[PDB]
């Protein structure tokens, strides 16, 4: 009577006790993936029998099955109720097609809130203090270069304290960035978002809401980009946004690469409109801009925002806990994405 | 008539109104420095006349005069009452010889507390996240290197949250480091210092005191060095300290370079005792260690701790205000260092 769960890719690596418990409550079936076409044929032939859930324990696990298109989804068994996956993004998945077949989806939203906010704070520190340029000077091992750059940095460096952070988006990650920047570093906060923060959150952060991106640009010393990536957010930060910013201002991005136009950013740095910028995410990722690399004051990292052991622990906790709640406890998912359906026990 | 003030190096750069006020109240004399030996000869020949104060508006200004040793000091005019200087902790000054001549000294203590504590927080984030290595991979411009290093960092990177910060020293700068690390990032605090923290510092930070440096080393996930540099703190962090640390731990330094033994640090990274380290200050400054440069996980900066325009505004305000108070207002110095003297 144990419900049956298809495992896409490797078993758990972080949470050993929880994974042992999961394998007693549920019959776990390894997919043994080879290719996308091979997986479609295994489904058509009912190789795995009727199953009620699918689990995917890491971002890099089960990529042999990609893409999850409408064609593949049409061969899933009629018994299927829920699919839970590691990560925030799901580009490999046609979610509308999955929901049309009556299947509930959960991502692992919230798992990397601490990691991604800390990394944004690192970038904010870097662009105010010009620390990226300082590191490259130190790494020459040349004494005169050390002294020259020590002096040069003092002409342009500032403390965050007392300066205005402009939040593009005020979701959970940005709420942590703001708490750390306001109470920790002593910055002031303005924000732009489709829905207002509640009176309590606004009071706790001293957050003032503005009505347009232009108003946000006009008031910021440093802009923090943290929004979901969709068609509506492609090149959200464009030539017109940079034109509205203050001379000698700064920008950071931990969201998705194309949210900021790479060419508009380069032009704003070349003209002196921006003093500095920090990108963890890149328009043509994994190709970093050679033009940005060759400049003095652009901080560049390898999409490490959520890359911390604690995030990966929480990916395993959330995926197992979602399926346990939904099929055994009669309780709703913690982190649904797309359409919501009724639980069972 | 107006008291006379010797200017060491460049005039003011930030506080134009306060500097114009200063030049009205006081006759300001440019030192016109060439070399140290040439300055001693100028003082011997009475080239500047009798003056009542000396001012030094920036840490990098007036360095041609160094050192302010006993021989140089012996030729200062007996009219001299006060010397105010930017920065704090000065290896270039014989403070006991200056006070022997009845001359009061002020540094600019406190001006850089925000800047130095923020730069220490940057190094703490760097050593936990392996961000220094990530930057170097990004700057290759090679797509395969980008993907490979993204995966590699996931094997070793951790959130500071819930880990222990071990403070060596709990003075003004470290109290701000700890406030930001504990309340902001979610770390826990253990400390060593020569004196107990006030009951309010301890309650606010959840601070646990230990009795020795080996006890502090053993308890820590990341050590933060912030103490005054003097004979008794030379090589404070040595082979025995690193032996006491846990496998895979981390250390940062924003104090002075020789507080940590360069050779001991190199050895502890080579063996795997330390995962990562962050240095703003260097034992043989301005030469940074070539052995540390050639490794994966050592974060290295050009002594930028206090380098922020707001620090420099406060250096100019404190130096000018100190001299005005002490020579014209009959008021004590705001930031004395060494012996205290009665104002005119």
Which of A195, A242, A244 minimizes the C-alpha distance to A218? Answer: A244
Query: Which residues, including other chains, have CB under 8 Å from residue B203's CB and lie 6 or more apart?
Result: none
What is the strand order of the sheet A27-30 is part of? A27-30, A4-7, A53-56, A82-85, A104-106
Using CA atoms, how far residue B64 sits from B37, B238, B308, B320, in Å, is: 9, 34, 24, 22
Backbone angles phi and psi of A168, in degrees to 5: -90, 105
Rounded to the nearest angstrom, the gap between the alpha carbon of residue B149 and the centroid of all alpha carbons in its chain is 34
What tokens appear for B8 in the block?
Answer: 């060491």
Residue A227 assigned ligand-binding role: yes
Out of B256, B282, B297, B325, pick the active-site residue.
Answer: B256
- Joined tokens for residue B78: 């007996």
Q: Rounded to whole angstroms, how far apart are CA atoms A135 and A203?
A: 38
Rounded Cα gap, residues A308 and A286, in angstroms: 20
Contact between B166 and B191 (Cβ < 8 Å):
yes
**CA B73 to each of CA A90, A141, B341: distance values in angstroms, whole numbers, following the listed order:** 72, 36, 18
Show residues of chain B in contact with A303, CB under 8 Å. 150
Task: Name the residue among A78, A59, A74 with its Cα closest to residue A8.
Answer: A59
With H, G, I as helix, E, B as strand and everything else as coil, classify residue A172: helix
Contact criterion met (CB below 8 Å) for B54 and B5: yes
Q: B276: which strand partners?
A: B250
Tell me if chain A has a CB within 8 Å of the CB of B315: no
Hey, is the C-beta of A147 within 8 angstroms of any chain B C-beta? yes
Q: Suggest the residue from B9, B110, B301 to mutate for an interface test with chain A (most A CBs closer than 10 A).
A: B301
Instruction: Give the separation between CA A122 and CA B43, rounded to whole angstroms.
Output: 49
Q: Which residues fall within 8 angstroms of residue A251, CB to CB, at 6 or more apart?
A: A127, A222, A223, A225, A237, A245, A260, A265, A274, A277, A278
Query: Are B311 and B173 contacting, i.e. CB atoms less than 8 angstroms apart?
Result: no
Question: In this structure, are residues B276 and B301 in contact, taking their beta carbons and an 8 Å threshold?
Answer: no
Distance between CA atoms of B174 and A120, rounded to whole angstroms?
A: 23
**Specified resolution (Å):** 1.9
Residue of B nearest to A114 (CA): B159
Active-site residue list of A: 256, 285, 303
Token reading at B262: 């360069």
Residue B63 to residue A276: CA distance in whole angstroms:
31
Q: After which residue numbers is chain B interrupted with C–N beyond 2.5 angstroms?
A: none
If we measure between CA atoms, which residue out of A123, A127, A131 comes closest to residue A150? A131
| Ramachandran quadrant class, A248 (left: phi over 0; alpha: psi -120 to 50; beta: rest) | left
Is B293 touching A (CB cutoff 8 A)? Answer: yes
Q: Which segments of B249-326 does DSSP mark as H helices, in order?
A: 262-270, 290-293, 309-324
What residue ranges in A27-185 does DSSP mark as E strands? 27-30, 53-56, 82-85, 104-106, 164-168
Strand partners, A285: none
Tokens of A306: 């959520």
What does the alpha-carbon distance between residue B193 and residue B201 come to, in Å, rounded to a whole number?
Answer: 13
Helix or strand or coil: residue B136?
Answer: helix
DSSP 8-state code for residue B198: P
Compare all CA atoms of chain B with the CA of A117 and give the residue at the minimum distance.
Answer: B185
The answer to whether B264 touches B238, Cβ cutoff 8 Å, is yes
Asked if B184 reaches chain A (Cβ–Cβ under 8 Å), the answer is yes
Instruction: Tell me how far apart the alpha carbons of residues B87 and A280 are, in angstroms, rounded to a whole number.
Output: 35
State whether residue B36 sits within 8 Å of chain A by CB.
no
Residues of chain B found within 8 Å of residue A114, distances taken between Cβ atoms: 159, 161, 186
Cβ neighbour number for residue B21 with a 10 Å cutoff: 13
A280 is in an annotated binding site: yes
The answer to whether B317 is a known catalytic residue is no
Distance CA(B318)–CA(B316), nearest Å, equals 6
d(CA A333, CA A179): 28
Both structure tokens of B36: 């140290």
Report the alpha-carbon distance of residue A80 to residue A49 in Å, rounded: 11
Chain B residues with CB-CB distance to A184 below 8 A: 121, 179-180, 183-185
**B231 in A contact zone (CB under 8 Å):** no
Q: Which residues of A touch B165 (CB under 8 A)?
A: none
Residue entry with tokens 């590191």 = A135
| Contact status, residue B186 vs residue B206, Cβ threshold 8 Å | no
Element spanning B192, H or E: strand B188-192
Distance CA B167, CA B112 (A): 19
Of A272, A5, A281, nearest to A123 by C-alpha is A281
By what method was this entry solved?
X-ray
Distance CA B262, CA B207 (A): 29
For A76-193, list the strands marked E by DSSP: 82-85, 104-106, 164-168, 188-192
Q: What is the distance in angstroms between the CA of the first residue and the CA of the last residue of chain B?
A: 15
Chain A residues in contact with B312 by the CB 8 A cut-off are 154
Spatial separation of the C-alpha atoms in residues B12 and B56, rounded to whole Å:
10
- What tokens were used for A251? 């920008």
Say which residues have a Cβ less than 8 Å from residue B54's Cβ, sequence separation at least 6. Answer: B5, B6, B8, B80, B82, B83, B84
**Coil, strand or helix at B217:** helix
Contact indicator for B128, B259 with CB cutoff of 8 Å: no
DSSP for A188-250 reads EEEEE-SSPPPHHHHHHHTPEE-SSHHHHHHH-SEEEE----SGGGTT-B-HHHHHHSPTTEE
Measured CA to CA, the distance from residue B27 to residue B2 in angstroms comes to: 6
Neighbours of A322 (CB within 10 A): 27
Query: Taking CB atoms and an 8 Å cut-off, how many pairs form between chains A and B?
Result: 169
Do the Cβ atoms of B154 and A180 come within 8 Å? no
Q: CA B65 to CA B38: how far, in whole Å? A: 9
Q: Find the catalytic residue in B100, B135, B285, B310.
A: B285
* Cβ pair A324, A22 in contact under 8 A: yes
Look-up: residue for tokens 């009219």? B79
Nearest by CB: B302 against A126, A137, A288 = A137
Q: Minimal CA–CA distance to A275: which of A136, A129, A135, A137?
A: A129
Find out whether the peptide bond into B286 is cis, omega within 30 degrees of 0.
Answer: yes
Of B56, B127, B114, which Cα lies nearest the Cα of B87?
Answer: B56
The reply, when asked if residue A268 is annotated as ligand binding, is no
**Binary contact (A134, B302; C-beta < 8 A):** yes
Helix (H, G, I), strand (E, B) or coil at B56: strand
- Sequence-separated (6 or more) residues with CB below 8 Å from residue A25: A2, A324, A328
Nearest-angstrom CA–CA distance, B260 and B241: 10
Is B193 marked as a binding-site residue? yes
As a residue count, chain B comes to 344
SS3 label, residue A274: strand
- Structure tokens of B312? 């420099």
d(CA B199, CA B195): 12
Cα B191 off chain centre by: 20
Residue (of B183, B264, B181, B270) closest to B223 by Cα position:
B181
Among A114, A151, A301, the residue with its CB nearest the CB of B60 is: A151
Determine whether the interchain pair B135/A132 forms a contact, defined as Cβ–Cβ distance below 8 Å.
yes
Residue B260 is given by DSSP the state: B
B186 touches chain A (CB under 8 A): yes
Q: Could you give the CA distance from residue B74 to residue B91 in angstroms, rounded to a whole number?
A: 19
Cα A6 to Cα A57, A72, A74, A97, distances in angstroms: 11, 15, 16, 19
**Separation between Cα atoms, residue B10 and residue A268, nearest integer Å:** 34
Q: Within an 8 Å CB–CB cutoff, is residue B38 touching chain A?
A: no
How far apart (Å, rounded) are the C-alpha atoms in residues A161 and A156? 15
* Domains of chain B from N-terminus onward: 1-112+309-344 (3.40.50.720), 113-308 (3.40.50.720)
Nearest to B125 by CA among B89, B160, B95, B99: B160
Of B135, B158, B307, the CB nearest to A300: B135
A255 is in an annotated binding site: yes
Q: In chain A, positions 57-96, which contact chain B (CB-CB < 8 Å)?
A: 60
Q: Which residues of A touch B301 (CB under 8 A)?
A: 131, 134-135, 138
Question: Annotation-wise, does B227 bind a ligand?
Answer: yes
Give the mutation candidate from B307, B312, B315 for the A interface (greatest A CB count, under 10 A): B307
What whole-number distance in Å separates Cα of residue A280 and Cα of residue A177? 15
Q: Is B300 on the interface with A (CB under 8 A)?
A: yes
B119 membership: H or E segment, kind and range: helix B113-129
Residues with Cβ < 8 Å from A101, sequence gap 6 or more? A73, A74, A76, A80
**How many whole angstroms separate alpha carbon B59 and alpha carbon B314?**
12
**Contact yes or no for B36/B78 (Cβ under 8 A):** no
Give, in order, the Cα–Cα distances in Å from B43 to each of A107, B6, B67, B80.
Answer: 76, 11, 14, 12
Three-class SS of residue B143? helix
Distance of CA B131 to the CA centre of its chain: 24
Contact between B131 and A122 using a beta-carbon 8 Å cutoff = yes
């Amino acid at each position: 009577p144990r419900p049956r769960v298809l495992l896409l890719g490797d078993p758990a690596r972080h949470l050993d006790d929880l994974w042992s418990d999961f394998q007693q409550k549920f019959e776990v079936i390894p997919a043994n993936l080879t290719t996308h076409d091979g997986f479609k044929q295994a489904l058509r032939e009912k190789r795995y029998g009727d199953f009620e859930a699918i689990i995917k324990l890491a971002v890099e696990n089960g990529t042999e099955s990609y893409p999850w298109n409408a064609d593949l989804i049409s061969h899933l068994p009629s018994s299927l109720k829920v699919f839970a996956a590691a990560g925030a993004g799901f580009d490999w998945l046609d979610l509308d097609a999955l929901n049309e077949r009556g299947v509930a989806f959960a991502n692992s939203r919230g798992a990397g809130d601490t990691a991604t906010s800390d990394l944004a704070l690192y970038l904010i520190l870097s662009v105010f203090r010009l620390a990226s340029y300082s590191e490259r000077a130190a790494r020459t091992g040349d004494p005169e270069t050390f002294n020259r750059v020590h002096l040069e940095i003092g002409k342009s460096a500032h403390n965050p304290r007392g300066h205005v952070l402009g939040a593009v988006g005020l979701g959970a990650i940005q709420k942590e960035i703001a708490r750390k920047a306001v109470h920790g570093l002593g910055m002031k906060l303005v924000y732009y978002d489709v829905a207002p923060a509640d009176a309590e959150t606004e009071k706790a952060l001293g957050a003032e809401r503005v009505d347009s991106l232009e108003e946000l640009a006009r008031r910021s010393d440093c802009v923090s980009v943290s929004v979901p990536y969709m068609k509506l957010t492609h090149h959200l930060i464009d030539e017109a946004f940079f034109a509205a910013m203050k001379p000698g201002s700064r920008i950071v991005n931990t969201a998705r690469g194309p949210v900021i136009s790479q060419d508009a950013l380069i032009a704003a740095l070349k003209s002196g409109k921006l003093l500095s910028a920090g990108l963890d995410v890149h328009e043509f990722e994994p190709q970093v801009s050679k033009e940005l690399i060759e400049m003095k004051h652009v901080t560049l990292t390898t999409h490490i925002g959520g890359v911390a052991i604690e995030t990966f622990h929480e990916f395993e906790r959330l995926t197992m806990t979602n399926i346990d709640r939904f099929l055994l406890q009669g309780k709703p998912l913690l982190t649904p994405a797309g359409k919501v359906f009724a639980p069972s026990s």
